[PDB]
Subunit: 122 residues, 4 copies
Amino acid sequence: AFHDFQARVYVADTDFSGVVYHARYLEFFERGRSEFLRDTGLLASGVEGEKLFFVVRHMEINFSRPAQIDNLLTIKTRISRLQGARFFMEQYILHGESMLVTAKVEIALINEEGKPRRLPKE
Amino acid sequence: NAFHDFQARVYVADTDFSGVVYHARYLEFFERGRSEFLRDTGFNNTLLASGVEGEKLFFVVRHMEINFSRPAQIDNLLTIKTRISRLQGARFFMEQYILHGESMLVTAKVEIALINEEGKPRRLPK
Amino acid sequence: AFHDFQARVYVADTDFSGVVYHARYLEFFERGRSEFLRDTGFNNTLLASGVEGEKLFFVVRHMEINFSRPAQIDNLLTIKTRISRLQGARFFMEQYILHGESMLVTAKVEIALINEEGKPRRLP
Amino acid sequence: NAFHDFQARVYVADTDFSGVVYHARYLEFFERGRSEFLRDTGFEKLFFVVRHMEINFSRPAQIDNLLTIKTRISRLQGARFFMEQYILHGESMLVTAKVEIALINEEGKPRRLP
Protein backbone atom coordinates (compact mmCIF):
# COMPACT_ATOMS: atom_id res chain seq x y z
CA ALA A 1 0.00 0.00 0.00
CA PHE A 2 0.88 3.67 0.01
CA HIS A 3 2.52 4.94 3.15
CA ASP A 4 0.87 8.10 4.46
CA PHE A 5 2.66 11.18 5.81
CA GLN A 6 1.34 14.68 6.58
CA ALA A 7 2.90 18.17 6.27
CA ARG A 8 1.68 21.69 6.98
CA VAL A 9 1.70 24.32 4.21
CA TYR A 10 3.58 27.42 5.50
CA VAL A 11 4.46 30.93 4.16
CA ALA A 12 7.89 29.65 2.98
CA ASP A 13 5.96 27.22 0.75
CA THR A 14 3.90 29.78 -1.13
CA ASP A 15 4.49 32.24 -3.97
CA PHE A 16 2.96 35.56 -5.15
CA SER A 17 -0.04 33.80 -6.78
CA GLY A 18 -1.31 32.65 -3.38
CA VAL A 19 -0.56 28.97 -3.96
CA VAL A 20 2.26 26.58 -3.06
CA TYR A 21 5.30 27.20 -5.32
CA HIS A 22 5.59 24.28 -7.73
CA ALA A 23 9.15 23.29 -6.82
CA ARG A 24 8.21 23.04 -3.15
CA TYR A 25 6.09 19.96 -3.92
CA LEU A 26 9.40 18.22 -4.57
CA GLU A 27 10.22 18.97 -0.91
CA PHE A 28 7.02 17.44 0.37
CA PHE A 29 7.54 14.42 -1.90
CA GLU A 30 11.01 14.04 -0.47
CA ARG A 31 9.57 14.02 3.03
CA GLY A 32 7.24 11.26 1.81
CA ARG A 33 10.22 9.17 0.64
CA SER A 34 12.31 9.66 3.84
CA GLU A 35 9.38 8.80 6.10
CA PHE A 36 8.65 5.78 3.97
CA LEU A 37 12.26 4.64 4.63
CA ARG A 38 11.92 5.40 8.36
CA ASP A 39 8.73 3.27 8.31
CA THR A 40 10.74 0.23 7.24
CA GLY A 41 14.39 0.73 8.33
CA LEU A 42 23.57 5.64 8.37
CA LEU A 43 24.50 5.87 4.64
CA ALA A 44 25.66 9.47 4.98
CA SER A 45 27.70 8.94 8.18
CA GLY A 46 30.85 7.02 7.10
CA VAL A 47 29.71 3.58 8.14
CA GLU A 48 30.91 0.56 5.99
CA GLY A 49 33.68 2.59 4.27
CA GLU A 50 32.11 5.51 2.37
CA LYS A 51 29.39 8.13 2.50
CA LEU A 52 26.50 7.02 0.23
CA PHE A 53 23.53 9.14 -1.00
CA PHE A 54 20.18 8.56 -2.60
CA VAL A 55 19.99 10.50 -5.79
CA VAL A 56 16.97 11.39 -7.91
CA ARG A 57 17.65 10.23 -11.47
CA HIS A 58 14.28 10.91 -13.06
CA MET A 59 11.07 12.60 -12.21
CA GLU A 60 7.65 12.92 -13.86
CA ILE A 61 5.25 15.34 -12.20
CA ASN A 62 1.64 16.29 -12.90
CA PHE A 63 0.28 19.34 -11.10
CA SER A 64 -3.52 19.36 -11.22
CA ARG A 65 -4.62 21.37 -8.19
CA PRO A 66 -2.98 23.91 -5.84
CA ALA A 67 -2.43 23.84 -2.12
CA GLN A 68 -3.06 26.96 -0.05
CA ILE A 69 -1.41 28.46 3.01
CA ASP A 70 -2.35 26.44 6.15
CA ASN A 71 -3.50 23.30 4.24
CA LEU A 72 -2.64 20.09 6.06
CA LEU A 73 -1.39 17.91 3.17
CA THR A 74 -1.22 14.11 2.80
CA ILE A 75 1.72 12.48 1.04
CA LYS A 76 1.31 8.89 -0.20
CA THR A 77 4.44 6.94 -1.14
CA ARG A 78 5.16 3.34 -2.17
CA ILE A 79 7.79 1.43 -4.14
CA SER A 80 6.44 0.62 -7.57
CA ARG A 81 9.46 -1.47 -8.70
CA LEU A 82 12.80 -2.50 -7.11
CA GLN A 83 15.83 -3.28 -9.32
CA GLY A 84 19.06 -3.76 -7.33
CA ALA A 85 20.91 -0.66 -8.56
CA ARG A 86 17.72 1.51 -8.49
CA PHE A 87 14.14 1.67 -7.27
CA PHE A 88 11.02 3.48 -8.49
CA MET A 89 8.41 5.26 -6.48
CA GLU A 90 4.92 6.49 -7.03
CA GLN A 91 3.76 9.54 -5.08
CA TYR A 92 0.68 11.72 -4.62
CA ILE A 93 0.01 14.78 -2.51
CA LEU A 94 -3.58 15.30 -1.46
CA HIS A 95 -5.59 17.73 0.63
CA GLY A 96 -8.18 15.50 2.36
CA GLU A 97 -9.81 13.70 -0.59
CA SER A 98 -8.71 16.15 -3.29
CA MET A 99 -5.80 15.13 -5.56
CA LEU A 100 -3.22 17.96 -5.99
CA VAL A 101 -0.02 16.54 -7.53
CA THR A 102 1.17 13.13 -8.84
CA ALA A 103 4.73 11.88 -9.42
CA LYS A 104 6.79 8.93 -10.69
CA VAL A 105 10.37 9.10 -9.27
CA GLU A 106 13.54 7.18 -10.10
CA ILE A 107 16.09 6.82 -7.25
CA ALA A 108 19.65 5.49 -7.47
CA LEU A 109 22.54 5.37 -4.98
CA ILE A 110 25.84 7.26 -5.23
CA ASN A 111 29.01 7.93 -3.22
CA GLU A 112 30.74 11.26 -2.45
CA GLU A 113 32.38 11.55 -5.89
CA GLY A 114 29.09 10.61 -7.63
CA LYS A 115 29.83 6.99 -8.59
CA PRO A 116 26.92 4.49 -8.80
CA ARG A 117 26.63 1.77 -6.14
CA ARG A 118 24.26 -1.18 -5.80
CA LEU A 119 21.58 -1.47 -3.07
CA PRO A 120 21.60 -3.42 0.31
CA LYS A 121 18.95 -5.48 2.24
CA GLU A 122 15.50 -3.84 2.66
CA ASN B 1 13.48 28.64 -33.50
CA ALA B 2 16.66 29.17 -31.44
CA PHE B 3 17.39 28.25 -27.80
CA HIS B 4 17.50 31.32 -25.55
CA ASP B 5 20.59 31.31 -23.33
CA PHE B 6 20.72 32.37 -19.69
CA GLN B 7 23.49 31.97 -17.11
CA ALA B 8 23.34 31.53 -13.34
CA ARG B 9 25.97 30.77 -10.72
CA VAL B 10 25.61 28.07 -8.04
CA TYR B 11 25.81 29.34 -4.49
CA VAL B 12 25.71 27.59 -1.09
CA ALA B 13 21.90 27.94 -1.03
CA ASP B 14 21.61 25.73 -4.12
CA THR B 15 23.49 22.77 -2.62
CA ASP B 16 22.70 19.83 -0.37
CA PHE B 17 24.56 17.58 2.03
CA SER B 18 25.63 15.29 -0.86
CA GLY B 19 27.95 18.05 -2.05
CA VAL B 20 26.09 19.28 -5.14
CA VAL B 21 22.98 21.13 -6.32
CA TYR B 22 19.79 19.96 -4.55
CA HIS B 23 17.44 18.34 -7.08
CA ALA B 24 14.55 20.82 -6.59
CA ARG B 25 16.82 23.85 -7.10
CA TYR B 26 17.25 22.87 -10.79
CA LEU B 27 13.54 23.69 -11.11
CA GLU B 28 14.31 27.23 -9.83
CA PHE B 29 16.97 27.56 -12.51
CA PHE B 30 14.51 26.28 -15.17
CA GLU B 31 11.98 28.87 -13.93
CA ARG B 32 14.66 31.61 -14.45
CA GLY B 33 15.07 30.37 -18.03
CA ARG B 34 11.34 30.58 -18.72
CA SER B 35 10.88 33.98 -17.04
CA GLU B 36 13.80 35.41 -19.01
CA PHE B 37 12.28 34.02 -22.20
CA LEU B 38 8.98 35.73 -21.34
CA ARG B 39 10.69 39.05 -20.61
CA ASP B 40 12.81 38.73 -23.81
CA THR B 41 9.53 39.23 -25.66
CA GLY B 42 7.32 41.42 -23.47
CA PHE B 43 4.75 39.87 -21.13
CA ASN B 44 6.45 39.61 -17.71
CA ASN B 45 4.88 38.11 -14.56
CA THR B 46 4.02 41.55 -13.15
CA LEU B 47 2.22 42.54 -16.38
CA LEU B 48 0.08 39.39 -16.46
CA ALA B 49 -0.54 39.64 -12.70
CA SER B 50 -1.38 43.35 -12.73
CA GLY B 51 -4.88 43.04 -14.17
CA VAL B 52 -4.04 44.99 -17.34
CA GLU B 53 -5.51 42.28 -19.58
CA GLY B 54 -8.90 42.55 -17.82
CA GLU B 55 -8.18 40.06 -15.04
CA LYS B 56 -5.03 38.93 -13.21
CA LEU B 57 -3.27 36.05 -14.93
CA PHE B 58 -0.58 33.59 -13.90
CA PHE B 59 1.43 30.90 -15.60
CA VAL B 60 1.17 27.42 -14.10
CA VAL B 61 3.23 24.32 -14.61
CA ARG B 62 0.85 21.56 -15.56
CA HIS B 63 3.27 18.75 -16.27
CA MET B 64 7.03 18.45 -16.05
CA GLU B 65 9.55 15.72 -16.99
CA ILE B 66 13.06 16.00 -15.59
CA ASN B 67 16.15 13.97 -16.27
CA PHE B 68 19.03 14.37 -13.79
CA SER B 69 22.16 13.14 -15.61
CA ARG B 70 25.12 14.95 -14.10
CA PRO B 71 25.53 17.13 -11.05
CA ALA B 72 26.26 20.86 -10.82
CA GLN B 73 28.97 21.82 -8.33
CA ILE B 74 29.37 24.82 -5.99
CA ASP B 75 30.36 27.93 -7.89
CA ASN B 76 29.64 26.34 -11.31
CA LEU B 77 28.48 28.74 -13.96
CA LEU B 78 25.33 27.31 -15.52
CA THR B 79 23.94 27.79 -19.03
CA ILE B 80 20.16 27.42 -19.19
CA LYS B 81 18.61 26.72 -22.61
CA THR B 82 14.94 27.38 -23.21
CA ARG B 83 12.63 27.44 -26.19
CA ILE B 84 8.93 26.98 -26.82
CA SER B 85 8.39 23.78 -28.79
CA ARG B 86 4.55 23.68 -29.07
CA LEU B 87 1.84 26.35 -28.82
CA GLN B 88 -1.88 25.50 -28.41
CA GLY B 89 -3.75 28.73 -27.56
CA ALA B 90 -4.31 27.73 -23.89
CA ARG B 91 -1.24 25.47 -23.18
CA PHE B 92 2.35 25.73 -24.38
CA PHE B 93 5.30 23.33 -24.24
CA MET B 94 8.94 24.04 -23.39
CA GLU B 95 12.19 22.12 -23.76
CA GLN B 96 14.80 23.25 -21.24
CA TYR B 97 18.42 22.22 -20.74
CA ILE B 98 21.07 22.88 -18.09
CA LEU B 99 24.74 22.64 -19.00
CA HIS B 100 27.99 23.41 -17.34
CA GLY B 101 30.14 24.45 -20.31
CA GLU B 102 29.63 21.66 -22.84
CA SER B 103 28.49 19.17 -20.25
CA MET B 104 24.76 18.39 -20.15
CA LEU B 105 23.53 18.08 -16.54
CA VAL B 106 19.74 18.18 -16.44
CA THR B 107 17.04 18.27 -19.16
CA ALA B 108 13.31 18.97 -18.96
CA LYS B 109 9.98 18.99 -20.80
CA VAL B 110 7.51 21.39 -19.32
CA GLU B 111 3.84 22.05 -19.97
CA ILE B 112 2.59 25.55 -19.05
CA ALA B 113 -1.01 26.79 -18.77
CA LEU B 114 -2.40 30.29 -18.09
CA ILE B 115 -4.90 30.82 -15.27
CA ASN B 116 -6.75 33.58 -13.46
CA GLU B 117 -6.90 34.47 -9.74
CA GLU B 118 -9.67 31.86 -9.37
CA GLY B 119 -7.63 29.06 -10.98
CA LYS B 120 -9.85 28.95 -14.07
CA PRO B 121 -7.93 28.41 -17.38
CA ARG B 122 -7.68 31.21 -19.98
CA ARG B 123 -6.51 31.42 -23.58
CA LEU B 124 -2.96 32.54 -24.43
CA PRO B 125 -2.72 36.18 -25.69
CA LYS B 126 -1.40 37.47 -29.07
CA ALA C 1 5.98 31.24 28.22
CA PHE C 2 7.29 29.07 25.37
CA HIS C 3 5.13 27.29 22.85
CA ASP C 4 6.86 24.20 21.57
CA PHE C 5 6.80 22.88 18.05
CA GLN C 6 8.64 20.02 16.44
CA ALA C 7 10.11 19.81 12.96
CA ARG C 8 12.30 17.16 11.27
CA VAL C 9 15.40 17.89 9.11
CA TYR C 10 15.28 16.64 5.52
CA VAL C 11 17.84 16.79 2.70
CA ALA C 12 16.12 19.93 1.41
CA ASP C 13 17.23 21.78 4.59
CA THR C 14 20.95 21.01 4.20
CA ASP C 15 23.85 22.50 2.32
CA PHE C 16 27.15 21.15 0.99
CA SER C 17 28.87 21.41 4.41
CA GLY C 18 26.82 18.66 6.02
CA VAL C 19 24.45 20.75 8.12
CA VAL C 20 21.20 22.78 7.82
CA TYR C 21 21.77 25.79 5.52
CA HIS C 22 21.63 29.00 7.62
CA ALA C 23 18.50 30.51 5.99
CA ARG C 24 16.45 27.34 6.57
CA TYR C 25 16.52 28.06 10.33
CA LEU C 26 14.42 31.12 9.37
CA GLU C 27 11.86 28.76 7.79
CA PHE C 28 11.87 26.75 11.02
CA PHE C 29 11.23 29.93 13.11
CA GLU C 30 8.40 30.97 10.76
CA ARG C 31 6.88 27.53 11.43
CA GLY C 32 7.32 28.31 15.11
CA ARG C 33 5.51 31.65 14.75
CA SER C 34 2.73 30.20 12.59
CA GLU C 35 2.09 27.34 15.03
CA PHE C 36 2.15 29.79 17.92
CA LEU C 37 -0.52 31.75 16.04
CA ARG C 38 -2.44 28.53 15.32
CA ASP C 39 -2.53 27.99 19.09
CA THR C 40 -4.49 31.25 19.53
CA GLY C 41 -7.14 29.53 17.37
CA PHE C 42 -6.20 32.04 14.65
CA ASN C 43 -4.05 31.63 11.51
CA ASN C 44 -2.49 33.15 8.39
CA THR C 45 -5.50 32.42 6.17
CA LEU C 46 -7.92 33.87 8.76
CA LEU C 47 -5.93 37.08 9.00
CA ALA C 48 -5.85 37.39 5.20
CA SER C 49 -9.66 36.97 5.07
CA GLY C 50 -10.83 40.18 6.76
CA VAL C 51 -11.63 39.53 10.43
CA GLU C 52 -10.40 43.00 11.53
CA GLY C 53 -12.43 44.31 8.55
CA GLU C 54 -9.46 44.31 6.13
CA LYS C 55 -6.89 41.83 4.74
CA LEU C 56 -4.07 41.47 7.30
CA PHE C 57 -0.47 40.26 7.06
CA PHE C 58 2.38 39.67 9.47
CA VAL C 59 5.69 41.15 8.38
CA VAL C 60 9.16 40.75 9.93
CA ARG C 61 10.65 44.23 10.55
CA HIS C 62 13.83 43.21 12.32
CA MET C 63 15.68 40.05 13.34
CA GLU C 64 18.83 39.17 15.29
CA ILE C 65 19.93 35.55 15.02
CA ASN C 66 22.79 33.76 16.73
CA PHE C 67 23.95 30.46 15.05
CA SER C 68 25.67 28.42 17.82
CA ARG C 69 25.41 24.67 17.10
CA PRO C 70 24.27 22.91 13.90
CA ALA C 71 21.34 20.64 13.14
CA GLN C 72 22.16 17.37 11.30
CA ILE C 73 20.21 15.45 8.68
CA ASP C 74 17.23 13.70 10.24
CA ASN C 75 17.51 15.53 13.58
CA LEU C 76 14.22 16.13 15.24
CA LEU C 77 14.29 19.78 16.25
CA THR C 78 12.26 21.58 18.86
CA ILE C 79 11.17 25.13 18.11
CA LYS C 80 10.44 27.30 21.18
CA THR C 81 8.55 30.54 20.56
CA ARG C 82 7.24 33.21 22.95
CA ILE C 83 6.20 36.85 22.92
CA SER C 84 8.57 39.05 24.94
CA ARG C 85 6.88 42.49 24.46
CA LEU C 86 4.00 44.35 22.82
CA GLN C 87 3.71 47.95 21.58
CA GLY C 88 0.14 47.85 20.28
CA ALA C 89 1.42 48.16 16.72
CA ARG C 90 4.76 46.28 16.92
CA PHE C 91 5.35 42.96 18.75
CA PHE C 92 8.55 41.08 19.62
CA MET C 93 9.25 37.37 19.97
CA GLU C 94 12.13 35.37 21.40
CA GLN C 95 12.67 32.10 19.56
CA TYR C 96 14.78 29.04 20.14
CA ILE C 97 15.67 25.97 18.07
CA LEU C 98 16.98 22.94 19.98
CA HIS C 99 18.13 19.40 19.27
CA GLY C 100 16.69 17.72 22.35
CA GLU C 101 18.23 19.91 25.00
CA SER C 102 21.12 21.35 23.01
CA MET C 103 20.56 25.00 22.01
CA LEU C 104 21.24 25.34 18.27
CA VAL C 105 19.96 28.77 17.22
CA THR C 106 18.26 31.73 18.98
CA ALA C 107 16.52 34.73 17.54
CA LYS C 108 14.88 37.98 18.63
CA VAL C 109 12.17 38.95 16.12
CA GLU C 110 10.22 42.19 15.61
CA ILE C 111 6.87 41.67 13.89
CA ALA C 112 4.30 44.18 12.60
CA LEU C 113 0.76 43.83 11.21
CA ILE C 114 -0.06 45.46 7.86
CA ASN C 115 -2.86 45.60 5.29
CA GLU C 116 -2.72 44.85 1.56
CA GLU C 117 -1.24 48.34 0.94
CA GLY C 118 1.78 47.92 3.23
CA LYS C 119 0.25 50.34 5.69
CA PRO C 120 0.57 49.45 9.46
CA ARG C 121 -2.32 48.51 11.79
CA ARG C 122 -2.69 47.88 15.56
CA LEU C 123 -3.11 44.32 16.95
CA PRO C 124 -6.58 42.73 17.55
CA ASN D 1 37.37 49.28 0.99
CA ALA D 2 34.38 50.57 -1.03
CA PHE D 3 31.20 48.55 -1.33
CA HIS D 4 31.19 45.71 -3.83
CA ASP D 5 28.19 45.59 -6.16
CA PHE D 6 26.18 42.67 -7.44
CA GLN D 7 22.81 42.44 -9.15
CA ALA D 8 20.11 39.80 -8.82
CA ARG D 9 16.64 39.58 -10.33
CA VAL D 10 13.59 38.53 -8.26
CA TYR D 11 11.74 35.45 -9.68
CA VAL D 12 8.57 33.55 -8.71
CA ALA D 13 10.63 31.27 -6.45
CA ASP D 14 11.66 34.29 -4.36
CA THR D 15 8.12 35.38 -3.43
CA ASP D 16 5.41 34.49 -0.88
CA PHE D 17 1.61 34.58 -0.73
CA SER D 18 1.53 38.28 0.33
CA GLY D 19 2.99 39.33 -3.04
CA VAL D 20 6.49 40.30 -1.88
CA VAL D 21 9.82 38.47 -1.48
CA TYR D 22 9.88 35.86 1.31
CA HIS D 23 11.96 37.25 4.22
CA ALA D 24 14.32 34.27 4.29
CA ARG D 25 15.10 34.65 0.59
CA TYR D 26 16.99 37.95 1.21
CA LEU D 27 19.59 35.87 3.06
CA GLU D 28 20.25 34.07 -0.24
CA PHE D 29 20.79 37.35 -1.95
CA PHE D 30 23.19 38.62 0.74
CA GLU D 31 25.10 35.37 0.39
CA ARG D 32 25.43 36.03 -3.38
CA GLY D 33 26.96 39.44 -2.51
CA ARG D 34 29.41 37.80 -0.09
CA SER D 35 30.50 35.21 -2.73
CA GLU D 36 30.85 37.71 -5.49
CA PHE D 37 32.77 39.88 -3.02
CA LEU D 38 35.16 36.93 -2.48
CA ARG D 39 35.39 36.21 -6.19
CA ASP D 40 36.28 39.90 -6.72
CA THR D 41 39.32 39.50 -4.42
CA GLY D 42 40.43 36.26 -6.10
CA PHE D 43 39.37 33.52 -3.66
CA GLU D 44 39.75 18.53 5.94
CA LYS D 45 37.51 20.70 3.74
CA LEU D 46 36.89 24.27 5.00
CA PHE D 47 33.55 26.13 4.87
CA PHE D 48 32.36 29.63 5.75
CA VAL D 49 29.79 29.84 8.52
CA VAL D 50 27.46 32.60 9.57
CA ARG D 51 27.87 33.01 13.35
CA HIS D 52 25.60 35.94 13.91
CA MET D 53 23.23 37.98 11.78
CA GLU D 54 21.25 41.14 12.39
CA ILE D 55 18.81 42.09 9.65
CA ASN D 56 16.59 45.10 9.09
CA PHE D 57 13.64 44.61 6.76
CA SER D 58 12.69 48.09 5.78
CA ARG D 59 10.90 48.11 2.31
CA PRO D 60 9.70 45.06 0.24
CA ALA D 61 11.18 43.79 -3.05
CA GLN D 62 8.70 42.66 -5.77
CA ILE D 63 8.91 40.14 -8.61
CA ASP D 64 11.00 41.28 -11.63
CA ASN D 65 12.89 43.90 -9.59
CA LEU D 66 16.52 43.99 -10.48
CA LEU D 67 18.05 44.18 -7.02
CA THR D 68 21.48 45.71 -6.20
CA ILE D 69 23.47 43.98 -3.47
CA LYS D 70 26.16 46.06 -1.68
CA THR D 71 28.77 44.23 0.34
CA ARG D 72 31.90 45.28 2.25
CA ILE D 73 34.05 43.98 5.13
CA SER D 74 33.35 46.18 8.12
CA ARG D 75 35.81 44.60 10.59
CA LEU D 76 38.57 41.95 10.48
CA GLN D 77 39.58 39.83 13.53
CA GLY D 78 41.87 36.95 12.35
CA ALA D 79 39.50 34.08 13.26
CA ARG D 80 36.44 35.85 11.78
CA PHE D 81 35.24 38.80 9.71
CA PHE D 82 32.23 41.11 9.61
CA MET D 83 30.31 42.27 6.61
CA GLU D 84 27.75 45.01 6.36
CA GLN D 85 25.31 44.49 3.54
CA TYR D 86 22.49 46.34 1.84
CA ILE D 87 19.96 45.40 -0.77
CA LEU D 88 18.54 48.18 -2.93
CA HIS D 89 16.03 48.47 -5.78
CA GLY D 90 17.71 51.28 -7.74
CA GLU D 91 17.96 54.12 -5.18
CA SER D 92 15.35 52.73 -2.76
CA MET D 93 16.71 50.92 0.36
CA LEU D 94 15.15 47.51 1.04
CA VAL D 95 17.12 45.45 3.55
CA THR D 96 20.27 45.96 5.62
CA ALA D 97 22.40 43.32 7.36
CA LYS D 98 25.38 43.03 9.65
CA VAL D 99 26.91 39.54 9.47
CA GLU D 100 29.72 37.85 11.39
CA ILE D 101 31.46 35.06 9.49
CA ALA D 102 33.86 32.31 10.73
CA LEU D 103 35.77 29.49 8.96
CA ILE D 104 35.52 25.89 10.22
CA ASN D 105 36.28 22.36 9.01
CA GLU D 106 34.06 19.22 8.62
CA GLU D 107 34.09 18.27 12.34
CA GLY D 108 33.12 21.77 13.59
CA LYS D 109 36.35 23.30 14.93
CA PRO D 110 37.33 26.85 13.84
CA ARG D 111 40.42 27.73 11.72
CA ARG D 112 42.38 30.69 10.23
CA LEU D 113 41.96 32.98 7.16
CA PRO D 114 44.39 33.42 4.16
